[PDB]
Each structure stands twice: as structure tokens, then as C-alpha cells.
Specification:
Organism (chain B): Neisseria gonorrhoeae
Number of helices of chain A: 3
Number of domains of chain B: 2
Number of domains of chain A: 1
Radius of gyration of chain B: 25 Å
Order of helices and strands of chain B: HHEHHEHEHEHHEEHHHHEEEEEEEEEE
Number of strands of chain A: 0
Domain KfrB (chain B): 333-387
Distance between the termini of chain B: 83 Å
Strand content of chain B: 15-25%
Keywords (chain B): Plasmid
Radius of gyration of chain A: 18 Å
Strand order of the largest sheet of chain B: 1-3-2-4-5-6
Bound molecules: ligand EPZ
Protein name (chain B): Zeta_1 toxin
Oligomer: heterodimer
Pfam families (chain B): KfrB
Chain lengths: 53, 394
């Protein structure tokens, strides 16, 4: 089997850990859909502000 | 660095705000491509730009900053984000990296945990690129897979799957917390047409593309064989899934399980009345008595089984075949006892037989204005509802 298929299978285990381990699920789901970080957002404001019309 | 393709405009019509947000988005993506891609790679949570996704690109647009605006502006910026992701895909492929031989596509309905599954993947030395996106309409993915094969890269497609209802619950939470949900129209479209797109890919590329699945209803079960992936994903037609989702978001709003804003984003641009009208009640009847009403369905063996019982006082005995109900014509007034209602329809026994009303009428909710057992007149004057009670004692 390829590395990719193994990587997917190992990801499926950690998906199963998310169901039991609640401390693990909150560590995963915190970042995902939050939005840009303060460092990235600072850079972005300079990018957006420098190109208004 | 130029964009890989032109950005398709949508017609927003009279909404000038979205029409301007779209133009601001296209201008930004087109003119500031170099610096957008640099920030995507060097500074976002994207494995240095190897995790490629249109949703993550939305975060680099100014209109997408506040959580309040995200559901509104989403469809105005998406195509710019998608073409940016397509451009980024190509730039990662241009990097001469002989060690890195694997490209992974992750696909599935919104809310199925595609992105959370990608977070749980540990990057490897051979992993070149990881693309999250829809493959239900696979025309665009053909070009991506084509240029992977041109460079002797090993393509793997992971189809993450989940029931529409459980997936819809996950989008509600994500919307409430981060302002980012998913419409029912696109959830039904992806889930219904994904088997076709994967077979379309399988027939065009064959063994050159490995196609696997993740069933999130069976504790994230890995599915190796393509025939098993198609059986997992075959969860109904677009009409069925959209219909079930339409009734679900409406029931959840009527019960107070979701807000009006979480309802409107889920609804998206759907006319729910139009969806509800398509629902069929053939092989179905309501039995009434002094204790209440009982919905029953008939299977092929000619046997009625109880689906739902609702206790109601003050009703006579009766059997009403819901499939034989006359659709209520607009303009006229229908007077009679409500014998049954659900998220889609309201059934009224008039003097000219059983009549069916849509539970919504021009964005106005009929079902909440009447109760089962209640005697009422329902009529629409100038596309505006008039429901009067006819209850009396004499
Ligand atoms: C179906 C759809 O429009 N959007 C959905 C799809 O995005 P995606 O797959 O990234 O987007 P694409 O429009 O299907 O496009 C896929 C590819 O098509 C080319 N293209 C895209 C647009 C365009 O104008 N011109 C053009 O050439 C380009 O190569 C791109 O990579 O898949 C995502 C799954 O993670 C969903 O979240 C997303 O829906 C969420 C809720 C939403 O819609 O906001």
C-alpha cells in the first residue's frame, strides 16, 4: 500500500479518538474555521489597505 | 503569477452589495495574486501552501473578516477563492521536488469532517499536495488530475461521507461559532452527484487514480474498494436529499433549535415552498379518531404500518388518503377541519374532499397558523395569507 493510503487510515483512527476523547476533539476543532490569526491578519490589513480603489 | 483561469461571474440581479463585493473580490484576486498566494503559503495553517482549499482562501479576502458577513458574502467571493486555489495547486506542482510523489484529493458534503480529517493526517516526505474540494462536477478536477499524471505523481481521492442530517447539524454549530455554514442546495447537489463524478473520474483515468472512502456514520470506517465507495455514497437523489434537508431546517427553525440567521444561510437561495410541493404522499394515509391522528404508510405487501401518532381531542373517525388530496389553487378560500400537517404540507378536509396546502406560502408559514383538529378557512388575497377560525359552540 502507498504512503497516502496509510496516512488516510491513521487519520481515520484519530477521527475515532475524537468521539471518545473530548479533550482531543476540542484541540482539533479550535483552529480549523476560526479565521486568520492576528499575525496573518496584520499582514492582510496592509495588503488590503495598500490596494483600495 | 497569473491566475490559472478566468473567474466566473454570478448574476446577483438587484442586490448591488453582492455585485460590488464580487467585483472587489475578482479585482483583488486578479491583481494581487503574487502576494495573496505568498500569505496563503508562508503564514496560514496550510502546511506551507500544500493544503490547498478554496474555503481557506476566503479568509484572505477583506469582506470575509467579520463572522457576521461571511454567510452573506460567501457566494460573491467563492469563485475568486476557487480560482486562487486552482492557481496555488499549479504553483505547488511547478516546484521541482523529486522526493514528493503523492497528491491527495479530499471530497465530500459540507459538514462531514473533511477538514478535521485533513488536520488528523500527518504529512509525509512523499506528500506533495493535498486538495480539498468538490468532485461531484468533476470537469475541473480532470485538469488537476491530468497535470498530476503528466508529472508521474500518484493521485489518491478520499471521499468523506456522512448522512445529510448529521452533516447539517455540524454546519449549524460551525455557523453559530464562526459564521460559516453551508446551504442545503449545495449539500444536496454534492451528496447526490458525487457517485456520478467519482465514476466519471474512474472511467476516464482507471487504475492511475486510486479512489477510497471514509464512512463517518460507521466511526470513520476506511473503504478501500471503489464498488464499496459507491454504495456508501449512494444516499439518495438530489430531489430526495434536498427535500429531507428542506423539511429538516424548517422543523429545526419552527422548534427553536436554530436561529433565523442560521436558517437563512442553510436555506440559501431555495424557494422551500417549491421543494415542499414536490413531496409525494402516495402510499400514505391519516387515520383519525377521538384519541388523535395516525400517519400510516403502505409497503408492497399491502400492509399499513404506523409512522407517527399525534394525540388530539375532538375529532370524528375517518380515513384520509393523502396522495389523493387536491392541490389548493391560489385566490380561493378552503373551509374545513385540519386533519394532518407536517413540515411540508397542511391537509384540510373540505366539503369537496381533502385539500392540500403547502406549509409555506410566499415566505409565509401556514403550518404554524393552524392546529390539527381545528376548523378554519384558508385563503390567499393578493399573495397574502388569510386564515380565519370557524370554531363555534351551538
Ligand atoms: C460547488 C461549489 O461551488 N462549492 C463547493 C466546492 O468548492 P470548490 O471545489 O473549491 O469550488 P468549485 O466552484 O466547485 O470550483 C472547483 C474548481 O473549478 C475551477 N473554477 C472554479 C470557479 C470558477 O469561476 N472558475 C474555475 O475555473 C477551479 O479549478 C476550482 O478549483 O467544494 C467545497 C468542498 O470543500 C464546498 O465547501 C464548496 O461549497 C461552499 C459552501 C461554497 O460554495 O461556498
Amino acid at each position: 500500500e502507498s504512503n497516502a493510503i496509510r496516512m488516510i487510515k491513521e487519520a481515520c483512527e484519530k477521527n475515532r479518538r475524537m468521539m471518545t476523547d473530548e479533550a482531543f476533539r476540542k484541540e482539533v476543532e479550535k483552529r480549523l474555521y476560526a479565521g486568520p490569526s492576528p499575525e496573518l491578519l496584520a499582514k492582510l490589513r496592509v495588503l488590503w489597505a495598500a490596494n483600495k480603489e | 503569477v497569473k491566475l490559472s483561469s478566468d473567474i466566473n461571474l454570478r448574476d446577483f440581479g438587484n442586490n448591488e452589495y453582492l455585485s460590488s463585493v464580487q467585483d472587489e473580490a475578482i479585482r483583488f484576486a486578479t491583481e494581487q495574486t503574487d502576494e495573496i498566494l505568498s500569505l496563503y503559503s508562508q503564514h496560514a495553517d496550510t502546511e506551507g501552501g500544500r493544503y490547498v482549499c478554496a474555503d481557506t482562501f476566503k479568509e484572505l479576502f477583506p469582506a470575509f473578516e467579520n463572522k457576521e458577513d461571511r454567510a452573506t458574502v460567501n457566494n460573491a467571493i467563492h469563485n475568486s477563492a476557487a480560482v486562487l486555489s486552482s492557481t496555488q495547486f499549479d504553483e505547488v506542482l511547478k516546484r521541482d521536488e523529486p522526493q514528493k510523489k503523492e497528491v491527495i484529493f479530499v471530497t465530500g458534503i459540507p459538514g462531514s469532517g473533511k477538514t478535521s480529517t485533513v488536520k488528523n493526517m500527518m504529512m509525509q516526505d512523499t506528500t506533495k499536495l493535498l486538495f480539498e474540494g468538490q468532485l461531484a462536477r468533476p470537469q475541473s478536477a480532470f485538469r488537476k488530475i491530468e497535470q498530476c499524471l503528466e508529472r508521474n505523481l500518484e493521485v489518491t481521492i478520499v471521499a468523506v461521507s456522512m448522512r445529510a442530517e448529521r452533516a447539517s447539524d455540524n454546519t449549524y454549530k460551525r455557523f453559530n461559532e464562526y459564521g460559516r455554514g453551508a446551504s442545503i442546495g449545495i449539500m444536496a447537489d454534492i451528496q447526490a452527484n458525487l457517485p456520478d463524478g467519482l465514476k466519471q473520474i474512474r472511467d476516464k483515468f482507471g487504475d492511475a487514480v486510486k479512489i477510497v472512502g471514509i464512512n463517518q456514520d460507521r466511526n470513520s470506517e476506511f473503504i478501500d474498494k471503489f464498488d464499496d465507495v459507491i454504495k456508501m455514497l449512494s444516499l439518495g437523489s438530489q430531489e430526495q436529499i434536498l427535500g429531507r434537508l428542506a423539511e429538516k431546517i424548517q422543523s429545526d427553525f419552527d422548534s427553536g433549535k436554530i436561529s433565523r440567521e442560521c436558517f437563512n444561510q442553510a436555506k440559501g437561495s431555495m424557494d422551500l415552498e417549491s421543494v415542499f410541493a414536490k413531496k409525494e404522499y402516495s402510499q400514505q394515509r391519516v387515520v383519525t379518531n377521538s384519541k388523535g391522528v395516525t400517519l400510516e404508510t403502505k409497503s408492497a405487501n399491502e400492509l399499513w404500518s404506523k409512522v407517527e401518532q399525534i394525540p388530539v381531542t375532538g375529532m370524528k373517525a375517518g380515513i384520509y388518503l393523502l396522495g389523493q388530496a387536491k392541490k389548493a389553487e391560489t385566490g380561493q378560500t378552503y373551509s374545513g377541519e385540519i386533519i394532518y400537517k407536517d413540515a411540508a404540507a397542511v391537509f384540510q378536509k373540505t366539503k369537496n374532499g381533502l385539500v392540500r396546502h403547502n406549509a409555506t406560502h410566499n415566505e409565509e408559514r401556514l403550518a404554524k397558523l393552524v392546529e390539527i383538529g381545528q376548523n378554519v378557512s384558508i385563503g390567499s388575497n393578493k399573495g397574502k395569507l388569510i386564515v380565519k377560525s370557524l370554531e363555534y359552540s351551538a
